[PDB]
């Protein structure tokens, strides 16, 4: 009876601004929600060439794509067909700051995202505006219930040209549009990578792998 199929497509639109520079990016893709994998093809529709590291955007481009075990309730799959939304704050070690939101809906075999992204106070000679980032390091997100919704906190870091890192504190609130069975505290391990890009990142292929797990055995 589950509306979330073994293969689901993705259509999205991001509108945002980083240090005053406006942009629109549209996306289409496909993934395997029960295997926690997905690939997206992303195109800059307005604001090309982007004057900032693409990597600050990539975690904004759906925890429905997470391999959940049967003994951890799946907040995100239970949320469909009606859907869910998330709001995220991202605080970098050099006082760069981003806020992002996504409204996630579904029609047939396809997820639809409307994403808003805003970033400011990135230093002109830092790694974001000089485009010195290489990739996000693999991460572990702590998932926990507060105020009847799901919170996620994750320590994130971009590897930089030269082998250094650029750290970020991510805090997310996930809000389903209907009553669902809430999980106990658990973790989600993530890997995200740009598989391919053109020169100015006007065209980007993006892959994510996410799996949920307990950090402690259930209560006895």
């Amino acid at each position: 009876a589950s509306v979330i199929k073994p293969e689901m497509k993705i259509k999205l639109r991001m509108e945002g601004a980083v240090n005053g520079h406006k942009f629109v990016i549209e996306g289409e893709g496909i993934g395997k929600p029960y295997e926690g994998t997905q690939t997206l093809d992303l195109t800059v529709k307005e604001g090309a060439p982007l004057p900032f590291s693409y990597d600050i955007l990539t975690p904004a481009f759906n925890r429905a794509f997470t391999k959940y075990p049967k003994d951890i309730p799946d907040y995100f799959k239970q949320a469909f067909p009606e859907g869910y939304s998330w709001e995220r704050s991202m605080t970098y070690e050099d006082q760069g700051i981003c806020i992002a939101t996504s409204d996630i809906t579904m029609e047939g075999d396809c997820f639809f995202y409307k994403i808003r992204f805003d970033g400011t106070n990135f230093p002109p000679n830092g790694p974001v505006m000089q485009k010195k980032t290489l990739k996000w390091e693999p991460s572990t997100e702590k998932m926990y219930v507060r105020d009847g919704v799901l919170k996620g906190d994750v320590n994130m870091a971009l590897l930089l040209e030269g082998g250094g890192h650029y750290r970020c504190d991510f805090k997310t609130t996930y809000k389903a549009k209907k009553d669902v069975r809430l999980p106990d505290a658990h973790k989600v391990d993530h890997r995200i990578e740009i598989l391919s890009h053109d020169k100015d990142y006007n065209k980007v292929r993006l892959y994510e792998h996410a799996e949920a797990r307990y950090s402690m055995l259930p209560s006895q």
Partner: protein, 115 residues
Amino acid sequence: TQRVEQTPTTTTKEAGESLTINCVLRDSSCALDSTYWYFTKKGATKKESLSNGGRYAETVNKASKSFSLRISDLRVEDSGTYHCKAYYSWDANCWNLRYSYIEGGGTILTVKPSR
């Protein structure tokens, strides 16, 4: 038992003079990654981020695990506490510090008025 040793701990200087503050990671098998400097005017926990440039010259010596701030043309307004903060290089030996920072004990600077 890692510590950042910051020197000088306290200093009095005359206006127009220069000050070097030194921060050294001691008793550590970890290495320095990013480095940052902050100013606290008397009282204020609000941190003013000192960028390399103008009267502030920020240098790093990775081999010595030290970083330093040189302030030129000191003013009475420069009076207050200077703080250094470092993050750690990612490596297997210091893996659980890879998102953490460490700060010096701080430098309390008094700039005596001249003219």
